[PDB]
Ligand binder design. Structure first.
Ligand SMILES: [N]S(=O)(=O)[N][C]C1234B567B89%10B%11%12%13B85%14B%1158B%12%11%15B%139%12B%1061B%12%112C5%153B%14874
Ligand SMILES: [Zn+2]
Length: 258
């Protein structure tokens, strides 16, 4: 509730309040690249973000969410493994205290410095709340971050973080274009899984891009200045807000590329 990323409330404890934490399709997972199989049945992936309308950025005490107006069919994900149309509702990141950790998914056990999640809901279910009662309710586009060159399209996010340092703070964040966070290639891996935060609901088709984006050390250092705590409370830096890899169980990871 109550849940977080610490010793007494972190991922090892979540199962007590959220028993699905030990479920059959939990996320993240390690992506074993040798075992993932090219799937010719996957259709072309379509990321259509031209009309995306951002509203606000919020520090929710675990991460920050950039929120979108999803009241009309605008920013949508379709194709690939997906049947129908999934509407963008928000994005957020997971990141580490050091550049050698921070991602939730891993690639041949490699951890990236951070991971971006663009969260979408299946428009056949009418609203996000109904979508998370369905096994195909959500699609999350996951993008790895490595530290090197700056990502210019990220800088507007970085520069607003000073205004949402603590839990419960929000700021207007209109006219942000999420196209500036996408790598060149849409090559991906896909598998059925879950939300990686409580309530850990098993509603997600994961689409994890193979090509990371590069961000600068200065950009990620600013993520690490955020706080888990609220205003006036003792400072706990918002770092290491990632769940580690979970058992693959009865799943196969499919690749979009040969
Ligand atoms: N890492 S994740 O995208 O699986 N889960 C993060 C969340 B935050 B809150 B709503 B929002 B949407 B749902 B709950 B929490 B869960 C998705 B966003
Ligand atoms: Zn996430």
């Amino acid at each position: 509730h109550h849940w977080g990323y610490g010793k007494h409330n972190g991922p090892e404890h979540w199962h007590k309040d959220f028993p699905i934490a030990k479920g059959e399709r939990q996320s993240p997972v390690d992506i074993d690249t040798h075992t993932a199989k090219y799937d010719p049945s996957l259709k072309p992936l379509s990321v259509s973000y031209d009309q995306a309308t951002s509203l606000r950025i919020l520090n929710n005490g675990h991460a920050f969410n950039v929120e979108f107006d999803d009241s009309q069919d605008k920013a949508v994900l379709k194709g690939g493994p997906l049947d129908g149309t999934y509407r963008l509702i928000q994005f957020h990141f997971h990141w580490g205290s050091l550049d050698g950790q921070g991602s939730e998914h891993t690639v041949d056990k490699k951890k990236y410095a951070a991971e971006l999640h663009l969260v979408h809901w299946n428009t056949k279910y009418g609203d996000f709340g109904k979508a998370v009662q369905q096994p195909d309710g959500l699609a999350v586009l996951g993008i790895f971050l490595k530290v090197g060159s700056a990502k210019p399209g990220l800088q507007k996010v970085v520069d607003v973080l000073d205004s949402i340092k603590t839990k419960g703070k929000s700021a207007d964040f209109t006219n942000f274009d999420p196209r500036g966070l996408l790598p060149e290639s849409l090559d991906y891996w896909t598998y059925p899984g879950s939300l990686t935060t409580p309530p850990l609901l098993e509603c997600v088709t994961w689409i994890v891009l193979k090509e990371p984006i590069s961000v600068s050390s200065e950009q990620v250092l600013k993520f690490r200045k955020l706080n888990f705590n609220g205003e006036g409370e003792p400072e706990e830096l918002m770092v290491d807000n990632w769940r580690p890899a979970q058992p693959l169980k009865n799943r196969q990871i499919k690749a979009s590329f040969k």
